[PDB]
Every structure is written in structure tokens, then in C-alpha cells.
Chains A and B, each alone.
With several copies, the nearest count.
Chain A
């Protein structure tokens, strides 16, 4: 037995189910069965993603797009509102407009990352069983990958933490989801770099997966000096949550980040016989493109083209881009000194190869971001500024 009643279930208990059946009307009391039917659909039909996310944020009419009214029930000492317009320089006719093109609410987001989580461990168990690490160039493995890819985890980690004030401060539900998923993907990147190093240590006697050397490199090696300065500024030097997201993803990570992850470690992995690192950078680069789709929508579709404030927002976005592009060019100018430490491979690590890598990165960026906010950029001038740090 037990001290408390064993409650009978209304669904199956005969007496309670009969009482319920008698109370339930024999017809529906409305025909409108579409959850939050009044949301304005972005696409040809309202999505479940929109239904579960949109207007969960309880904004009042004095925060553009809000459907509620009145002041907040409790504000900060001094008067700062629970959410407010003072949180960012940008303006819009409706903060709810943003849509992630991937339509991630929480469930598809963790469904997809779970697939990657489980398949990664199966791949590692088989990769170790294969012995394929045997053909990796040992200098790359030990002196470039372990040390400088390790150090890169600190850039991913700082970009992750840049999102903490964004998660508190930003002004709508779909934006908050975009920001938080982006942050988890960044801290995942840092954790995945560390997982690869820990995995190599199990296969290569004497290989040290401690973060001691990567951290010393991140914090004191001139190669990462500019990158660390920019990350520290984006994370802890500002609180405008649109500036954090823009400077973090659309400038710094789209130029320095993409160069380091994709042009350096992923690309050179397939020139030095590294059959392992591409499995890991496949994940960071997939995450970068998913994050980009959502960052693009917030800043290009919504803010740069908002009917009333698009040019106003472009004024700030252009000022931000000038500042953080300068920061990122300096970061890349420092970073390409790393090439002085690698074994020369024609077309990859010589001046022509690095010039073409920077042309892809700055050329892609001009197309993906600069052209869409009206930011003029001379690609060749940015390439040449970075190449000044290349040791011939």
C-alpha cells in the first residue's frame, strides 16, 4: 500500500471516463485549429517553427512589433526595462520579423546535433581500428595541428561567450533562438577541436593533448595576437547585441574564422596526409553555413531592408564593418605568419596559394555580406594588406 490516494486516471477509469464523456460537448466550440493562426507567415504556408516560436516574447507595443501593452511589472534598479530599445542602436518596424531559414526550434536542433554526436563516436572507434593515422605527416600533426588548431579553440570559445549578453538582451524570440543555437555551435567547435586532440593522444605515444601549449599560443603567440584582440572586444568590449552578432559572425568569423578553419586547417589537412581533421572541420563548416543563413536573414532581409530604418541600420552596419574588418585584416596579417612554419607545397603554402586563399575569403565575404549592406570593399587591397604579413 501507500499513504496517499492512488489517483484514478480520467482516460481509463470507467467511472471518471463516463463523467468526462457526459461533460464534453458533442461539437467543437470553434473551427480555428491553427495554433497562433494570426502570425504573418514568412513562407507560402505558416510553419510549425513559426507557430512554436513567434510571439513567445511578451513585448508591449512600445517595443516595435509587440502585441501587449503597459510597462513591465518589475524593472532594474534605476529603471532599465526588462527588455528595451536602449539595448541596441538598430531599429525596425517589427523585431519579430526574423526567421531562421533552417526553421530550427529546439527539437530539430538537438535532433540534428544528436546524429552528429553518435556518428562521431562510431567514426572514431572505427578510425582507431583502421589505423589510418599512420600516414599523417608527423610535423603537421605535432607542430602545426596539435599546437595551432588547439589554439584556435580559444577563438571559438570566445565567440561562444560573446553570446551571453545577446541571450539576455535581444528583443525577439526567433532572434534569441538563432543566437543561442549559434553559441552552442561555437562552444561545440571548441569542444570538438579538443576531442580530436584527445583522440590523437590515444593513438600517438608522446602526443600531448593538454591545452597548456594551445593556451600559451593563443594568449602570447604573435600569430594569434590580432585574433585574440578582436575576440576579446566582440565578447567583452560591447553590449549592443546586434553589434556582437554582426561583428562576431558576419565580419570576424566570416573572414578570419573561415580562413583559419577552412583555408588553413581543413585545406592543408588534405595536402599533408591528415585523414582525421576533415571529419571535424566538416562539422564546424556545416555549423558556419547554418549560422550564416540565420545571421544573413536578421541583418540583410530584416534590418538592412526594413522599410523605415534600412538605411539608418546600414549606417551603423557600415561603421561596424569598417571597424571590425580592420580588426580582422590585422588578425589575418598576424595569422599568415604561421605559413613560415609549414612545409612548402606549391599552390597551397607559397605566396600564390595564400594569395588565392585570401581572394576566396575576401571575395566570398564581399558577395555574402558587404554587397548586401552597401559596404564598398576593394578585395585586392585587403589581400595585399594581409600578404604584408606573409614571409616570402
Chain B
């Protein structure tokens, strides 16, 4: 969810003993399946254009659970299901040659299953090769 995709969601809101009590709670001693993905874009002229006019416009239209946070040198993006960026759409926005490999110049990190397909970059919660 949108609230759950905040960087400081849930236990991250708590401080001091309140934080320790949940952090060491019995039920938080095993991992919990998450349907989210995390995408990190390092800041640059091209990426800042992509964030504002693609991820935060059509991207969030299609996936309202998207959260983008400012982390100084990078954008931290978390969303339910999957995040996609079409390099051809970005190249239209930038006015210069821009393949999917060019898009990767500033895609820094991914928590999830990432891959390219044509001009489009995708990071998805799906476990390809296991999920049917």
C-alpha cells in the first residue's frame, strides 16, 4: 500500500524503547513476505526528468501505491507489484538518443526481479521461473 511503501512506515516511525519493543517482538524474528519492489535512481538531469514526468505522472497513474523519497544523492522508489520505465518514452522527453542501456546509466539499485524487454525496464515482485 501507499502508506506501507513509505521509507519510515510502521516500526520506522517509532523511536527509543517503543522501537526496541517492536524490533524484538517474537513475530518479527522471521521475514515476512512483501509484495513490494524497491527501485533506486541516482540523481542526474535525465533521471530527474524521468522521475517528475514519467514515474510521478503516468507511472503513479497506473500504480498509485508508488512512493518516491528524496535521499540526497538518489531517489528511493517503492511500489506494490512492479515499477516500469520505457526508455523510448524517456528519450522522447529528453530529446536525445536514449536506449534501454542508456537508461541503465543511472538506475542504481533494485530490490526485486529486474530485467529489460525491448525498450522497457521492469522491476517486479514476480518470481519468474517459479510463479506461473
Q: What is A's interface to B at a CB cutoff of 8 Å?
A: 2-4, 6-7, 9, 44-51
Contact = CB atoms under 8 A, between A and B. Distances in A.
B96 A47 contact: yes
A132 B96 CA distance: 30
B72 A47 contact: no
Contact of A4 (B7, B93, B96): B7
Contact of A48 (B7, B67, B69, B94): B94
A116 to B, nearest CB: 16
B111 interface: no
Interface in B1-49: 6-9, 12
Chain B: interface size category: 10 to 19
B92 A48 contact: no
> Taking each of A4, A6, A7, which has the highest tally of chain B beta carbons within 10 Å of its own beta carbon?
A4
B49 to A, nearest CB: 9
Nearest to B92: A45
Interface of B: 6-9, 12, 67-72, 92-96
A9 B72 contact: yes
A56 to B, nearest CB: 16
B95 A48 contact: yes
A50 B95 CA distance: 9
Contacts of A51: 95
Q: Which 8 residue pairs of A and B lie closest in terms of their CB atoms, listed nearest first?
A: A3-B6, A3-B8, A48-B95, A4-B7, A2-B69, A45-B92, A47-B95, A48-B96
A4 B8 contact: yes
A46 B8 CA distance: 40
A7 B71 CA distance: 7
B69 A4 contact: yes
Given A45-B95, A48-B94, A3 B72 contact: no
A226 B29 CA distance: 61
Contacts of B7: 2-4
Contacts of A49: 95-96
Contacts of B69: 2-4
